[PDB]
Amino acid sequence: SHSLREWLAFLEGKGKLKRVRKEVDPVFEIAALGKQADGICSLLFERVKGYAVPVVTGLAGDRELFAAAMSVPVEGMLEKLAAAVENPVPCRLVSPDGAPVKECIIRENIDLLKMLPIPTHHAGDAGPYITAAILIARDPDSGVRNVSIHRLQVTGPDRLGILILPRHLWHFFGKAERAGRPLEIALAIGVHPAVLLASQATTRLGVDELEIASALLPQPLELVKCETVDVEVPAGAEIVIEGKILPGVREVEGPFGEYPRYYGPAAPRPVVEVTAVTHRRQPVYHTIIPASREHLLLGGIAREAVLLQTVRQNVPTVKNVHLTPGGSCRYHAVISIEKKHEGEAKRAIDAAFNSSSEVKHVVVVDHEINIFDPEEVEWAVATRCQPGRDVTIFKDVSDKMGIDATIPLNFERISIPGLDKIKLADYL
Amino acid sequence: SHSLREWLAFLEGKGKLKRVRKEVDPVFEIAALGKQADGICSLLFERVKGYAVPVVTGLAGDRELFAAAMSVPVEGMLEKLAAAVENPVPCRLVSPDGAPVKECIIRENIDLLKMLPIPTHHAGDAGPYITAAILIARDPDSGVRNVSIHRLQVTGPDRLGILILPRHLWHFFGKAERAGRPLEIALAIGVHPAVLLASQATTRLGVDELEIASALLPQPLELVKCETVDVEVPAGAEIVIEGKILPGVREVEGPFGEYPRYYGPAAPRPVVEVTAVTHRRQPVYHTIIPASREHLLLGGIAREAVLLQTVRQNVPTVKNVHLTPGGSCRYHAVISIEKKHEGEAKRAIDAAFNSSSEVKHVVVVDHEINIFDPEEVEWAVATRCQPGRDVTIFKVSDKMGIDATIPLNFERISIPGLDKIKLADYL
Numbered sequence: 058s059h060s061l062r063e064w065l066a067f068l069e070g071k072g073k074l075k076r077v078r079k080e081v082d083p084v085f086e087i088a089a090l091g092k093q094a095d096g097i098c099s100l101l102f103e104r105v106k107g108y109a110v111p112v113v114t115g116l117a118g119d120r121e122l123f124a125a126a127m128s129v130p131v132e133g134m135l136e137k138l139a140a141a142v143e144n145p146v147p148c149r150l151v152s153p154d155g156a157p158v159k160e161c162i163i164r165e166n167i168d169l170l171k172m173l174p175i176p177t178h179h180a181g182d183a184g185p186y187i188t189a190a191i192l193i194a195r196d197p198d199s200g201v202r203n204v205s206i207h208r209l210q211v212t213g214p215d216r217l218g219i220l221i222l223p224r225h226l227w228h229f230f231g232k233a234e235r236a237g238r239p240l241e242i243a244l245a246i247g248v249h250p251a252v253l254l255a256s257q258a259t260t261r262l263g264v265d266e267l268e269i270a271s272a273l274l275p276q277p278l279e280l281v282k283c284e285t286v287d288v289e290v291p292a293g294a295e296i297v298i299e300g301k302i303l304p305g306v307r308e309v310e311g312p313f314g315e316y317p318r319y320y321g322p323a324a325p326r327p328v329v330e331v332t333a334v335t336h337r338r339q340p341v342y343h344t345i346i347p348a349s350r351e352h353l354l355l356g357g358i359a360r361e362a363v364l365l366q367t368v369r370q371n372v373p374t375v376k377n378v379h380l381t382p383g384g385s386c387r388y389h390a391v392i393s394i395e396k397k398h399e400g401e402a403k404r405a406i407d408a409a410f411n412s413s414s415e416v417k418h419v420v421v422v423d424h425e426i427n428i429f430d431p432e433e434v435e436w437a438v439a440t441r442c443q444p445g446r447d448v449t450i451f452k453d454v455s456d457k458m459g460i461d462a463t464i465p466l467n468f469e470r471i472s473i474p475g476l477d478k479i480k481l482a483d484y485l
Numbered sequence: 486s487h488s489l490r491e492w493l494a495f496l497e498g499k500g501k502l503k504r505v506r507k508e509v510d511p512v513f514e515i516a517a518l519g520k521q522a523d524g525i526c527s528l529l530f531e532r533v534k535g536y537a538v539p540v541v542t543g544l545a546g547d548r549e550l551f552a553a554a555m556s557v558p559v560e561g562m563l564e565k566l567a568a569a570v571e572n573p574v575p576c577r578l579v580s581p582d583g584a585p586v587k588e589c590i591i592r593e594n595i596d597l598l599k600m601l602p603i604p605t606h607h608a609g610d611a612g613p614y615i616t617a618a619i620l621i622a623r624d625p626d627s628g629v630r631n632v633s634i635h636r637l638q639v640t641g642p643d644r645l646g647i648l649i650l651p652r653h654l655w656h657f658f659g660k661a662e663r664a665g666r667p668l669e670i671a672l673a674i675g676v677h678p679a680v681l682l683a684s685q686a687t688t689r690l691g692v693d694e695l696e697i698a699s700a701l702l703p704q705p706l707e708l709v710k711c712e713t714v715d716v717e718v719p720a721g722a723e724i725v726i727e728g729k730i731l732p733g734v735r736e737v738e739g740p741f742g743e744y745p746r747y748y749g750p751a752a753p754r755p756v757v758e759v760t761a762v763t764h765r766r767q768p769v770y771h772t773i774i775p776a777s778r779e780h781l782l783l784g785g786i787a788r789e790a791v792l793l794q795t796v797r798q799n800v801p802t803v804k805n806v807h808l809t810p811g812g813s814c815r816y817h818a819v820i821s822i823e824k825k826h827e828g829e830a831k832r833a834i835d836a837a838f839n840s841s842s843e844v845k846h847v848v849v850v851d852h853e854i855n856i857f858d859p860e861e862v863e864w865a866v867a868t869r870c871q872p873g874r875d876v877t878i879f880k881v882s883d884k885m886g887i888d889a890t891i892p893l894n895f896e897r898i899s900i901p902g903l904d905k906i907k908l909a910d911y912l
């Protein structure tokens with residue numbers, strides 16, 4: 058119930074899952090074929106050289122599918138996401154007996170690369186990477202639960218290197234290693250997209266992203282206890298890897314192809330020792346190809362929800378916001394307003410820059426411009442921006458720019474009568 | 486030989502011409518159906534309500550077809566066009582006997598709307614407009630020949646309103662009206678796309694765009710004398726309308742749906758009296774739908790050729806230029822350079838702004854960015870522009886330059902085998 062498998066069923070019946078029955082190499086070929094499907098359809102690789110386990114990529118690659126994953130029309134997606142962040146819903150603990158992720162359990166002679174078709178994605182990558190695992194951990198002093206997604210380099214049979222940015226997991230790990238103790242974690246792979254989307258919520262220090270996922274789903278998310286660590290994982294996941302981040306240890310992780318289409322450099326980083334693996338009988342392995350639409354939209358939609366709220370606080374006339382793919386759904390923002398007073402553009406711009414330190418470039422347009430169409434936003438810039446009046450620059454870590462491409466308060470688009478009414482097919 | 490009719494044959498055998506056998510109204514419906522084919526294929530309307538004459542639109546709607554019209558691959562289009570501008574080739578004057586455009590000649594009781602299926606394109610338009618006529622005229626003092634395309638409002642049986650922007654024809658007409666004389670002109674409709682493309686060259690004051698067209702074609706363009714005016718027109722055109730712009734007369738022309746997807750406002754403007762119409766037996770009438778890909782690329786390609794040359798003068802490391810469709814193939818420029826020294830971005834920007842008054846926004850990127858892909862240019866701006874260092878603003882329109890090149894002293898991620906492996910062969 059609201060598992061990856063049901064999501065794959067939903068995609069199949071919509072003709073947005075295609076299978077690939079011919080054998081593929083997990084080294085580069087999965088990523089290469091996945092890139093050609095980016096944004097059009099999900100691919101299920103039924104034969105991966107060296108493995109009985111299939112690989113799925115591109116579960117959702119456009120805003121219509123993420124809206125479907127949340128049971129909303131596109132129009133309501135951002136508000137539904139912000140409502141889930143504001144009002145989390147408890148998860149239900151469930152028995153391990155009959156939980157699909159407990160069907161097979163491995164505690165000895167663990168070899169991750171032997172069990173799982175973990176791909177190698179881009180040319181410069183140090184080796185195979187796990188890119189779609191939600192990482193569940195608890196604060197070792199306050200006990201609160203956090204979920205985030207981290208790249209994990211497969212460095213041995215039972216060892217992973219992990220990039221941890223200075224956010225919540227880092228805070229937890231900091232506390233474990235001041236006490237000289239490991240931090241217990243669980244990794245879950247093959248979950249519903251709503252759960253992945255929930256793992257990208259940026260919140261204050263103590264809100265459990267699994268509870269956010271619970272609010273987005275039709276029923277509460279069902280959890281089960283791990284075998285070897287005191288952590289909870291989604292009962293319906295495909296695969297769970299249990300382990301611990303080792304105190305003090307630093308090993309070289311990287312380099313790795315990342316979201317902005319550049320390499321993340323190699324450096325000494327924490328290490329996870331894996332103490333168990335559990336999975337469904339005949340699991341599906343999910344990978345996210347870095348810088349794909351799936352990768353960009355996961356974080357993007359979450360950042361857009363926050364951006365809409367921040368901008369709406371200061372500019373109640375805001376109709377919509379979009380973090381463009383060109384900007385890695387992060388650096389570039391387009392904001393539509395139903396403008397009433399001159400001065401609204403500047404306020405929307407100032408608000409976008411407080412949404413996150415990442416936003417670098419902001420364009421503001423009138424409500425009738427479709428901000429999801431780059432050609433129409435460019436047209437609005439071309440015809441409605443006078444740069445001496447309409448451009449502000451922030452100099453001083455990143456420079457930033459704001460562009461007011463709204464019509465001044467005191468421009469009708471040309472059209473052809475009959476164009477909705479008449480179809481070229483009926484005349485040929 | 487290198488007529489509109491041969492061009493339509495070339496499009497048919499490439500599956501890029503579709504015929505429309507059902508009757509269509511020239512008022513709005515041609516434009517509406519044409520807009521749905523914009524950029525996919527040319528349409529020949531075989532039955533236009535009220536007329537024996539068919540209408541063709543969208544002769545070329547992409548850079549591949551304009552390259553074919555010039556007998557070049559896309560990669561060489563801009564250089565081939567600039568070479569033709571630099572080295573024009575004389576036209577051949579030819580006898581009126583046997584010239585196809587002389588087959589039928591009308592000198593009396595001329596009613597343009599009765600003879601020709603002249604469309605009404607957009608809702609706000611003042612009436613039917615001729616949008617694909619090349620206008621040939623000579624300087625009444627220096628005698629040099631010019632070609633340009635002007636919208637012509639059909640205002641009576643033998644009368645047209647004309648928008649003339651302050652460029653070469655304006656200069657000529659200025660001189661005719663200080664002498665109190667009309668300016669004799671000819672309008673040709675239904676020509677090969679190379680000729681239309683040549684009419685959009687922006688040159689210094691005395692180079693004959695018909696000679697540019699001659700250089701682009703496989704053999705020199707054949708011209709013939711007009712019946713009632715001292716002007717030359719293409720022998721192979723479908724239709725020629727002869728006449729004169731009247732000295733002093735000003736009548737309201739407009740409004741009209743234009744290139745940037747806004748209405749051009751109504752105002753008092755010059756007027757053409759028509760003194761004759763000649764055509765092929767059973768002519769085809771060509772219309773250009775305003776703001777279509779055909780409209781935008783005709784002007785765009787010509788402005789890109791000139792822009793590449795101007796920028797190359799000061800920045801020999803320039804690889805390519807693109808005027809984006811977002812900017813109406815006019816306002817927004819993307820310039821790729823193989824950068825050697827810091828400072829090349831600023832020089833490319835400063836040169837683009839002197840190329841033409843119209844360019845408003847310039848982005849400079851490294852040679853490996855595909856400048857025809859807006860998402861990849863945006864990505865370059867997102868990752869390689871620091872606006873405190875990389876944005877210059879010039880203060881009629883303000884202008885902005887963006888340097889989105891890598892600073893000199895950033896590898897793009899990639900997947901081995903991606904050219905070699907095809908999704909269709911695996912599913």
Ligand SMILES: Cc1cc2c3c(c1C)C(C)(C)CC=[N+]3c1c([nH]c(=O)[nH]c1=O)N2C[C@H](O)[C@H](O)[C@H](O)COP(=O)(O)O
Nearest residue numbers: 188205206207208220221222224225226256257258345355
């Ligand atoms: C969706 C997604 C998010 C990644 C991510 C990727 C994906 C697909 C990759 C797997 C393909 C590779 C890089 N990732 C990392 C990352 N954060 C981090 O600290 N280390 C990472 O390696 N991020 C961002 C991180 O998951 C989010 O910013 C979290 O919301 C942080 O959560 P928190 O606020 O609870 O700490």
Ligand SMILES: Cc1cc2c3c(c1C)C(C)(C)CC=[N+]3c1c([nH]c(=O)[nH]c1=O)N2C[C@H](O)[C@H](O)[C@H](O)COP(=O)(O)O
Nearest residue numbers: 616633634635636648649650652653654684685686687783
């Ligand atoms: C291709 C094209 C070019 C038009 C044009 C259109 C087309 C389809 C229209 C017909 C559909 C609507 C508006 N047009 C006009 C126009 N120039 C002008 O002075 N008045 C106009 O009405 N332009 C631009 C003009 O033809 C070019 O700038 C010439 O190169 C100017 O030539 P010149 O340098 O010899 O003066």
Ligand SMILES: [Ca+2]
Nearest residue numbers: 441461462463
């Ligand atoms: Ca503005």
Ligand SMILES: [Ca+2]
Nearest residue numbers: 869888889890
């Ligand atoms: Ca730069």
Ligand SMILES: [K+]
Nearest residue numbers: 204205256258
């Ligand atoms: K999170």
Ligand SMILES: [K+]
Nearest residue numbers: 632633684686
């Ligand atoms: K011209």
Ligand SMILES: [Mn+2]
Nearest residue numbers: 203204225260
């Ligand atoms: Mn958190």
Ligand SMILES: [Mn+2]
Nearest residue numbers: 631632653688
């Ligand atoms: Mn000229």
